[PDB]
Structures are given as structure tokens and as C-alpha cells.
Assembly symmetry: C2
Homo-oligomer: 284 residues x 2
């Protein structure tokens, strides 16, 4: 494997679109019910800030997207979604919009047990940048090379004290059936036979839905009803969640507009979203 050729491979450029209905479908998919996100005539109707994470899946389609949606690139079943970063430069137009996506592999690191591959996506409207996404995939077993990439941000360490704030959300047993309508139609989240074939007695909930659930808690606690205050969020996905389980978001106020967080399944005491770092605009 040649990492230089992977990292010098030109960015891919594409178009993504969303309408108001897509925004509503997303809000219900992550279990949000506040009229700010579920009612187009609300005085403060907005896209939920995390929405751009769906756009690399949905792209330009208004229909079901077949799943799945570089040069020196070397088994899909060995790939885990390990990390996600989302940076919001400007809120999305809640009346709908069309964006240009530019995507590129920015890191390919040999972690020994496998490869960390970081894929960056930048979305722009007509004016300029609106969102920056970094998806960290772990490719199990792929090793034996000199890894290269960007300077990796510090690994988040959760404070050794009780959370400052807690929130809980009971997900529906059919949450994944609703959430998948926002772009990710991976059969792992709906077909019990596919889930069973990879070691799960029931389909698992999309990790990004869990991320949306935690985002809802962070927005509600800190952003004072203003989506423009939701600046950035990054997480590690640590263990699976099943639709029907209760997701607890534990939140640590660290000052300077920084909140560290975890999402935990109440029923099992399993950490599903770890090393959460949230940045928001401090009290206006």
C-alpha cells in the first residue's frame, strides 16, 4: 500500500440537495419533537445542526439510496465507523438548499490492529463553506506500512467526576426504520438476518442516530434555542445501541464554550458514544 498515492489522489466533487421535508424526516428520525425542528411554520424553524452528516449518503436523491452510497487504495465487512467530527460554519437554509461537496482521504494510519482512514467532506453553498465533516473508519486487519495523514487532534478524556448535566431519550424499537430514510439504507440496521450474520440478535441503531440523540441533549442544554450557537461536535463510537433502548447523554461543562460528553445505554450501562467534545457559542 502506497499512502502517498492515496493522499495525493484528487478530491471528489459532487452535489447534495435537501428540501424542507428532508429536514422534518431527519428530525423525527433522531427522535426530536420540538416544533423548532418538526414544524415548518414555527417562528424559529431550523434544520437540526447535525443534518449535514446525512448528505454524503443522500447526495442528490429524493428516493431510496442503494447501499453503499483513491489511487493507492488496497474487504468491506472489516470496516467500522469509529469516529465522527462535524463542524458547522453556517446554519443550513431551513427552506431547502443545494450544496457542493468536496471529499478526500486525509489520513491513512497504521494502528497495528488495523487502519485508521479519515475521510474529509467539505460542503459549500453559493456563498462558501457551510459544514466540514471528518469520518474516521477503522479497517480491521489492514497493516504493514508507513502511515501518513493530518495532525490528529488530541484524544478526548472524559473528566473524572460526576456529569454536570444529564438527559435521557427512550428510542423507539422502530427508530432505525425511520432514521434510515435520511440516507443510510444499510441492511444491518433493518434486516435481522443481516444483523445475525455479523453477530447481533437484532438490527443495531445507526451510530449517527445515536450521535443525533446526544446532539439533541447538547443543543437543548447549552444552545438556548439558537442553532447558530451549535459550532462543532466530535465523538468516538465505542459500542452498539439497539432500537428501543434508552440513551443517556452525560454532559461535563468545561468552560470556554466546551462540553465533554458520553452517550450511555441506560439498560446495560454500555458506553455507545465516548470521548465526546462539543463546542458552542457562550451566552450572548
Amino acid at each position: 500500500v502506497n499512502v502517498d498515492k492515496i493522499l495525493n489522489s484528487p478530491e471528489a466533487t459532487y452535489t447534495a440537495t435537501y428540501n424542507q421535508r428532508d429536514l422534518l424526516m431527519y428530525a423525527v428520525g433522531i427522535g426530536e419533537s420540538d416544533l423548532q425542528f418538526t414544524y415548518e411554520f414555527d417562528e424559529k424553524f431550523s434544520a437540526f445542526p447535525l443534518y449535514p452528516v446525512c448528505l454524503p449518503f443522500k447526495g442528490q436523491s429524493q428516493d431510496v439510496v442503494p447501499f453503499p452510497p483513491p489511487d493507492g487504495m488496497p474487504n468491506p465487512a472489516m470496516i467500522l465507523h469509529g469516529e465522527q467530527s462535524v463542524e458547522i460554519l453556517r446554519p443550513l437554509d431551513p427552506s431547502g438548499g443545494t450544496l457542493t461537496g468536496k471529499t478526500k482521504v486525509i489520513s491513512f494510519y497504521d494502528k497495528g490492529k488495523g487502519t485508521l482512514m479519515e475521510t474529509q467532506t467539505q460542503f459549500e453553498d453559493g456563498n462558501g463553506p457551510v459544514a466540514k465533516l471528518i469520518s474516521g473508519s477503522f479497517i480491521r486487519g489492514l497493516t504493514g506500512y508507513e502511515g501518513k495523514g493530518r495532525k490528529l487532534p488530541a484524544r478526548v478524556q472524559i473528566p473524572k467526576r460526576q456529569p454536570d448535566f444529564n438527559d435521557e431519550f427512550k428510542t423507539s424499537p422502530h427508530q432505525a426504520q425511520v432514521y434510515r430514510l435520511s440516507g443510510d439504507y444499510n441492511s444491518l440496521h433493518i434486516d435481522p438476518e443481516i444483523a445475525k450474520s455479523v453477530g447481533f440478535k437484532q438490527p443495531i441503531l445507526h451510530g449517527l442516530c445515536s450521535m443525533g440523540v446526544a446532539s439533541r441533549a447538547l443543543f437543548k442544554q447549552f444552545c438556548g434555542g439558537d442553532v447558530a450557537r451549535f459550532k462543532s461536535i466530535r465523538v468516538r463510537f465505542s459500542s452498539p445501541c439497539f432500537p428501543g433502548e434508552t440513551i443517556q447523554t452525560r454532559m461535563w461543562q468545561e468552560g470556554s464554550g466546551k462540553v465533554l460528553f458520553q452517550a450511555v445505554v441506560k439498560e446495560r450501562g454500555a458506553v455507545i458514544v465516548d470521548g465526546g467534545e462539543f463546542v458552542y457559542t457562550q451566552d450572548a
Copy 2:
């Protein structure tokens, strides 16, 4: 006041388009979880048989459809003037000639007012919608609107089918579905964006404690029970359904479907809110293809 004018008002023709994703969104909107209706690669993936009721709202839009849709707001010549305050969706009939293509489709809709009856206590206006493609008819819908107060005239319309008499005996079969308190927020995404079902201020405005669930969603919930009990996993067996909406349902309430087998492929039914014992869907008649005819 001119009924002859109303019934002679020319038919309106429009186009309706749905994709696979719309079918999934509808299925989750009515609370169905069966993979036959929620998973595009299920080996028997199908549109839920009641879906055509959404098409007059949706038309060809893939976005939010501001209420009321252009395809339903048009008043016939010559209609009275009174605003939607004294109007309610009282009755619905759905007849399926051919199941919808589950990969998506485009249909021609033809709509016409077919009845304008004086009920003594009000007016029943029946609006028929016929859907077809290049291969012929697919569905026939009849919607009944009630205008309370509007009386004193000679009424005319289609020959009405027999009034459904719900049997006094114990129901043969029962099913229940606990709706979500946010069920209307999801169901509205299939085409009916009426503020009545979401804005508490608009709901309180007309007398309700909170927004009410769409009557057609309740009809969907009853239809799910009927399909599950009688149709043996085959949408082609779901032939017709007609109901009246008797009282409102609130999102979050449990909908019980009471079913009476009458033989010859006919089932009578009611839908009831468990928490209040209130019938919300009454005079239900369901027609399906019998077991001995399942090829």
C-alpha cells in the same frame, strides 16, 4: 344552492407521483413495522394498500405541501362560501383495482364531486378520485365532507351503498396499536400538513386540548390490523375499505381495532381509543379476497 350546477362542474385532471422512499415514509407514518412495508428489499416488499389516499395531497411534490393542496382546495361551481370551520372529513372509501408498483410510479388523477346531499342537520359532499396509469384504473377513492348547518335544499348524488350495521355480538378478532405522542409529526410527511395536527395554538383555537391525529392515519392503523388478520401477507387480497370518522383521536392514544368476520370476504370493523372507550372510526366495511381464492 344549485346542486345541478355542483354535480355538473367539470372533472379536474392532475398527476401524482410517488417513489419507494415515499412508501417507506407512509408505512412508518401509520406505525407499521413489518418488513414487507418498511424494508425495500423484503422479498414481498409492497406499498401499503391504503397509500393512494395520500396522493391527492401529495400530487407530484417531494417537498412539504402547504395546506390545503391545490388538488383539493378547488371549490366546485357553484359552491357556497363558508370557510373550513363548519366542514369536517366525515367519510372515506378506498377501492383498489390494482396494487401500486412498489418501485415507484406516476398516475393520472381524475377528481369530481359526485354527491351533494342534505342530511337535515348538515350537508354531505362526496368527492371521487380515480387513479389510473397507461394500463388502466388502479384505485378509486371517495371522500365525504360534512358541512354542518348547510341545509334546506333538494339534494342529489350517486346511489349510496348500504349503511354498515356493526354487529351487536362480541368482535371475532381484536388488535391494538399504541400511537406515539408524535405520530402526527411523522404521518404529516406523507402529504397532509394541516396545522390542526401539529400546532397546539391552532388546535386550542378550534376547541381541542391538543392537536388531533389525522383521521386518515387512524384509518391506516385499522387497515394494518385488517391486512394482518385477513390478507395472508398479500396486498393483492386487500380489495376495498370504507369508514366514517366519528370522533377525534389524540396522538399518544391506543387505537383498538374490533373486527367482525361476516363471511364471503367481508369484514365489519370499528377503531376505538382504548383510554376513553370512544369510537373514532365507525361503520367500517373491509372486503378482501378469500382464502379459497388465494392462488
